[PDB]
Structures are given as structure tokens and as C-alpha cells.
């Protein structure tokens, strides 16, 4: 990069230079702002930056740094101890009168954010330990606030200088907690606490309850640590991580373990561990093109990153799993599994064509062996859903793989909570349909034989019942009924399969039932052999569910058109129009059966369709292209952050003589009636213009200088297939990338 | 892979028995490479179907030292039945990858006809039978192609005929396909005057910065069938770091005997050296890595470490490798692994005292080269043995104390 460095600008008091350098780092960690309020993620992140700056030759030795974690403590409104805090850092240099103080927390109104009187005295006490001849009259305190909170906004503030006692606050966060514990009343206000008297012993204890710690450079310089990781040789990357780099990170963490672990309960080890590692990487963000992919969702603790100068095409991805309770050798197994399937989970494989990765299990809490390292090859993301559905009938563990296939391809931007239950259900059912309805391959039996599959979808009589029912009939082989229903969609009955032409005498009927429970996990019951076909049809004559079985039309022509679309005809509008004419032709017979009820349903169906077809090689749903930043004796710098996301992104695989990935982007909207159609096309076309303002996000994903973008509106109330999917009629679809 | 894949791998490895434990350990790694290739064909085999493979790998005729005989193996794997046990494998895929050209077309014709018979006669009433049969052949070949790009290599899609390949044409194609058995097959079809040249071409083409584990068995076969290894070095030296790439990939797959042969030819028979200080250090640390991953082969890994480390051509590299600077030393990813190998308790080793002797000598060498840095060397080694986890390391045991005990032993 071309910045001055985050810590360098901050210490110099260059608030504008720090702002531009920080938004450049945010471009490098696109998920950073999702977790700025999770525990002490942000304070530990900034502490790690300050604690490794000297070793990185960012700060000089005479630029002494002092810090403390000002933990928020008990919440006066529920009595529970919080796990958040304010980080307070001061920099002092002998000979310079200005002492810059920084208060870092997610919110500018966070409790006790300002430096307190006792914090000033504890800091001066620490400064005097190295400078015994200190004259406090010659010290000029410059106090700052650095905050970022959720849209998302980040604020850098130069506080106004206050006179007399108002120069510093009455209490820090931990002081208020100390006194609330001392008085055994967590609901006491600051004004009430001020009224209470303290004996000489209590005031002495309160004064030493706050104390600063000097950050001291170690015996190892880390200037060239990112050079070790900017490599295309997995053995070199593994050796550098196993030795210098991960030894330094864990040992530096150990040097401040007492300040990190003490005076806080319910500490979020997960988010603090990731924040600590990110602060180390951020000290190089101004000199290297580092891509950091963070998955800190519930039940996930992954960080995958790639280190390069800028143009390198085959540098080694590094995949880390941060454990807090399990030993790091188990975390290494999780990191190896995450790295093997990196094409599913991460955007990192878009920035490198390396087939080798380095995986790391790391747990900062362990004193012995806090990390383990290995290498593993990168596998292709090509899961055959219908084939595995037939295989899971007689084989263990395949149900878990089927479940993982559906869940792992959900968009990361949709949280898996009860508030978004219908969003998750629309995505799973739509993706499962697109995969199964557009897979052109026959069934491969275990014995040396192959059979074509006729696919059906069942339209339940109750249009409110949330259940995707599909039937897969392989010729001369068994029949599989697939159910994916909501938690309140349980039924008692059988699907009538009389419409099927069963010629074999050994044809069985199987049932694979999936349920998305209230906790948004996908339970797949054991497959049930419902007996012989004619035996199954004899029974259940009085137990057949109400509804209709619709046959899925042939979709072989979509794969051929997709081949021409992603390759030679990716900039030809007529070729894209023909592709969606054929998708409309395949969907119109069953449109009201599959029920395209939401934008998520429409997007997920196309996601499964494009995934199953050989072309495109890669398709990403709700792909974040980047973000936009808007700027809005006290100096307040406030920046609003707006994300640009692509509903669908299609990409080729880079070849040796064809580095252009032909990036194709689709903006998808759904119109329920004619009145919404014009307003959905307008919103989709306006979203296109917002994407055309982003250039730096598209540059690393292709070697060319063009990106194709098309607005697509699903017309739910269309009466013929020709108007089901609305494509622009008749320029404006080739976004010229300005690399200048 | 999948959990089931690890189970079938262990089952097939348990069948390997041999008096020489070095031979048995090498054959188990060959089974691992075979499984990693053909896991898609055996992933769901129960013990009744797995017995066919048990008897195949129990046949000594299927082996040549620690490597599988692809000529004998490809024969047995294409048999319909061996001694009252039916072959459970999809035999078209076996005959394709093993280049059993006498059976590829008949086996495919069987699958083509039974698959063609499952379509209704009135399914596609716009196509002719010529177009119908070609569509069925393309659908079938595209279906088998999911298991690998090499499985449509032998069937012409226009005629359904067995494809014909020139010896040179097929050799270059199988190298690009990273197809071990096809490379060896087309090698034996080459004219004698071209054998050495084509093998060298495959080596320099695969010894590249982003080689993968699958490339190692091909590199091993090519090196083993090259007569003039001195000429091979000269051709490899025409490409930057070509010598490092070849040895590095071979080391990761535990082809120790092949690496030792290359080290003896190129380093033991001016000031120009065939690889750099970094290549030197990465050889030793990668050997130390696989030493811990494969305890049954730790003797061979240790010998290779000492051959490279103590080679007189790299005496300057050896001294630099024990130079403690910036609170680190390159040998820590070698000395530490050796201490862990010497101390591991999950194995029954006969020569632990020789292992301790090498460790003490390595420490004494580091102390002799830089006496004024030895205190930092000890500090660095203890820290590395406490922070960096390794395979074979006893969990919860302070290995820094083991380093302290060794340093105290040398006064």
C-alpha cells in the first residue's frame, strides 16, 4: 500500500492520515466492522497494534507507550458484569511537552471513556519510573477518542481542552465498578457515589486500582515478517509461521497476559483472540496488500488471509482456527477442514491460484504448545446433491455432508436467528431446488450401471404449508422422496406416486425428511425404506396427501447456453437474454409450485442452477464487492461506511493463457404485481449505478478491465414464460474498470 | 476426504505385512497414495467387497520393493473375478486409468448399452438414432468425468471408438493430466532413443513453484528411470530453483531413497552451488516434518538430514544455519524436531542413544561456531520447544526442560 501506518499517524496526531489509512485497512478486512462491539474486540485490536509497533520499527524507543484496560464492570441496570472496556493509551517522549492520550471503545458515550484524574496520576507515575526528573508543569495533555459502532460509523475525535479539575473526568469505568462493589449496590449513580465518603485505606486502594503498563520492545524485530508470508512456497510459509511469526504473536500475548486476564469476568476469548491477531496484521497494512477473511459467526472462529505486495497471483493462503477451550491440535483439524473447502467459505481463493494452503490451530490460553501448523491441498467445490441423496440411503455420514452442503452455501450476510427464519428457509429450499432441478447427470449406481433421473416437485394442497417436496425417480432403480419443511409444517400422509412409470420389479420408495428447527439447525432424519413401489401404492390409498405432482422439464439446454455465456459471449446482451429466456421456460410450468415467494427464493434458485452447471466455475451469492466512505478546539471526524454487495457474481477459473475471469454480476429483484415491476426495475438499475462507482473491489478479481452487470426482475404475476424473468431490452452493461 | 475414507484407508493399510518394517512402512504409504487416487471408487465398499482388494494387495506380485507394480496391479484390478471373489470395482474406470487397452472399449460398450436401454424409445422424437446414441454416449462420458478428467481419455466421442495415441503425444498428455499410471504406460511405448529426454521433460515441467502432492509419484517414477543423473542435473539447472522443487516435493511424500540417490549423485559425486542457503534450510526442516509424521521412517529421515546438513559442499550453509540472530536460528525447526523424535513415547525404537548423540553433536556445533551467541541460542531453543506444537509431542509436557537438561549435560 501507500499509507503512513495506522499507529504512526495516530501517535503524530495526524487524525486525517490515520483516517485514510484505517479505511484502507477496512478494505482489507471486509468483515471487521461486524464485530467491533463484541466484547473487547476493538480495544484488544488497538492494544495489539500499539504493543507490536516498536518491534515493527513503527515507533522509536524514545516514544514510550503506556496503556491500561479500563473495564466497564457491572452494568447498573441488570447487575451483570460486562465484558466490554475502554482501551486507554498514552504516548510520551522525553523532550516533547505534548502527551497524547487515546481512549478507544466502540461508542463515544461508553462508560468512563474519558481519562480520569486517577488515571492521569497513574500514568504520570509510570512515566516517572523511567524519567525520574519529570516536571509535570511541562506536560501538555492532548486527549483523543477513537470509536466505531453500528449502518456503521467510525469517529476520530480531538477532545476540547478543559481547565482545572474538569481537565480529567471524575471516575473511569473501573473506578465506578470498584465503588459499586465496595458499597454493595450496583445501581448507585455517579452522583450518589460522589456523596459517599471513603476512609484513607479505601482511597489508597482505589488509587492503585488504576495503573498503567509500559509497552516495552522485545529482542526481536518483526519488520520483515510479512515478507516471510508473501511467498508461493508452502514449506517456506509453514516454516515461518511455525517459528518466528506465531512464536512472536503468542509470546507477546504472554507478556501482557496479566493485564488482559485480570479485572474482568466473562471475557470473550474468541473475539479478543481474533482482535489481537488482527492488530498484528494491521501494523503491516500500509505496506502490503493483505486480504483478511473473518468468519466469527456463532459456532465459527476462522480467519483466512493472504499476504502479497500487490500483483502476485499464486501466494499461499493461511487458514487459522482460533480455539478458546479445545487444545490447538483439535483446532488444527478444524482449520485443515476449513482450508480444504476454502472455495465454499472464503473469497481468498479468488485472489490466488495456489492449490496449497497452510492451516493453523491456535489457542492463546495455552502456555505449552499454543499453536500447531500443517499444510493441505485446496479441493474443488463440486458437490452432487441428487447423487449423494441416493448414496445416503445405505451409507453413514452422507447425511452430514448433505446438511453441510446446504448450510455452508447460505449467504453469510443473513444471520441464522428466529427473526430471519423465513430468510434461511427460502435460501435452503431455493438452493436445493436449483441444484436438483438443473443437474443434467444421470444416477450412477454402485454396481456398474447408470440410469437417468426423472425429477418431480409436489405442490401441497395447503398453500401456507412451508415444505419443499421433490421426487427423484431413477429408471430401473429406487425412488427418493425429499422433504425440506419448516418446524410447523409436519404432516401425516404419503405422496401419491401413481403418475410415475415404474417398470422394474425391485423399485423401492425412500423418504429423506429434512426439518429446519426453531434453532435454525437442519435435522435430516434417517432415510426410510417405504417398501416396494406397488406395495407402497397399494397401501396409503387412504393416506395420500392432497396436492399435485409436477414433472421438472428438461434443462440440458441451460448448461450449453451457460457455457457460451460465461466464455465467448459474456459481453453480448443477446446471449444473456437467451439464457434467462430458457430459465424462464424451465420454471414457468412449475412457478407456482416451487413458489418464488421472496428475493431470497429467486436468488437461491439461480444460485443452485449456476452451481450445478459446469459453467460458471464459481458463483457467489450476496458477494461483498467493497465499501464506500462518506465524511461528515475540538475536531470531530465522522465517517459513514456503506457496503456494496452483488446479488450474484459469476466467475471463470483463471487459465494459463486466459487470466480474465469474465466477472458477471446480476442484480436480482422480485415483483409481486404489475405495479411493483416498474419500481423494481428502477431500484435494480439504481443498484447497478451504485456498483459502477466501485472499482477497487473488482480489480483483484479479474485480470481484465471490464465487469458485466445486468438488472434482473422476477415477474411473479407473469402469464407467459416470455415475461417471467424481466431482462433489459435493446451499452450500460459493461463497467469499465479504471485502474488509474 | 470423508470420515469413511479414513476408515477404508486404515483397513487397506492393516493388510500390509512384511518382515522388514522399513519395507512395510513404505508399502503402507503406497496404499495411501493409491487410496487418494481411487477413493471415489471404494468409498462405500463394505468388508465383503473390500476382501477383493485385500487379496490383491496381499499378492507379492503386485509389489516392487516399496512401490506398487502398475502392470500387475492393473491386470488384477480389471479381472472380473479372482479366486471365488467377484471384482466389486467399476472395471471401465480401472482399465482406463491403468491403460488396459484390450478391455477399455468392451467394458465401456457394456455401460453404454445398459444406459441406452433405460431411455424410452419415444423420449426424444426430434433426434435421430445417430443423434440419440451420441447424446447417450456424451451423457455417460460426462457422468463418469465427475470422478476425474482422465476418464474420457480413451473413448472417442464421435465414433465411440477406442482412441489411439502416439507414444510421445500420450506421454505429454498424461504428464499434464497428473496421471501416474498413464505416464508410466506411455513411457514404455516410447522409442528407446527418446526415453531419457521425455522423462527429463516431465521432471522439469512438474518441478515448479506450485507443485502438488499428486505430482510426487510421477517425479519419483521419472527420476528412478533416468540413467544419466548427472545430465539430468544440468537440464534441471536450466530453470531457476528447479533442483529445489524436485527434491522438496519428493521429501513431502517420503520418497527418501530417491532423494538420497539424488543427494549422493549431485553433492557427494568451484564455488558454484546447486541450491541456496534457503533451499538448504527448507530441505532439513521439511525432512524433520515428515520424520515426525512417519515415525517408522525416522531412521531414513535422520540419515537424509545428516547427509544434507553435513555435506562438505555446504559447510558455509551449515554454520549460517546455527547463527542465532534477531532472536531466532534456522536450525530450530530441525533440532527441535529431533529432540521431539528422540523423546516420543508412542513407539518402540531400538536406537534412541544414537538419536541423543546426534542432538548433542548438533548443539555442540552451534556452540562452537558462535560461543558468544550460545546463551541466546539456548534461550531461543527452549522458547521454540515450548510454544510450537508438533506431531509426536507429548501433550502437557514441558519440552523446554528437555533442552535445559541437554545443555547442562554439555557443561
Author numbering:
A (entry chain A): 2 to 151, 161 to 642, 649 to 746, 750 to 759
B (entry chain B): 4 to 272, 280 to 421
Q: Which statements did the authors publish about this structure?
A:
Cytoplasmic incompatibility (CI) results when Wolbachia bacteria-infected male insects mate with uninfected females, leading to embryonic lethality. Protein-binding experiments and expression of cif genes in yeast have shown that CifA binds its cognate CifB specifically and rescues CifB-induced yeast growth defects.
CidAwMel(ST), a rationally designed chimeric construct containing the scaffold of CidAwMel and the interfacial residues of CidAwPip, binds CidBwPip(Pel) and rescues CidBwPip(Pel)-induced growth defects in yeast. Interestingly, CidAwMel(ST) could bind a closely related CidBwPipND1-ND2 from Wolbachia strain wPip(Pel) (hereafter CidBwPip(Pel)ND1-ND2) to an extent similar to the binding of the cognate CidAwPip(Pel) (lane 2 vs. lane 4). This structure revealed the interacting residues at the CidAwMel(ST)-CidBwPip(Pel)ND1-ND2 interface (electron density for representative residues shown in Supplementary Fig. 7) and explained why certain CidAwMel(ST) variants show reduced binding to CidBwPip(Pel)ND1-ND2. For example, at region 4, residues R114 and K121 of CidAwMel(ST) interact electrostatically with residues E460 and D459 of CidBwPip(Pel)ND1-ND2, respectively. Finally, at region 9, residue R393 of CidAwMel(ST) interacts with residues E257 and D261 of CidBwPip(Pel)ND1-ND2 through salt bridges. In CidAwMel(ST-9), residue 393 is glutamic acid, which cannot bind to E257 and D261 of CidBwPip(Pel)ND1-ND2 due to electrostatic repulsion.
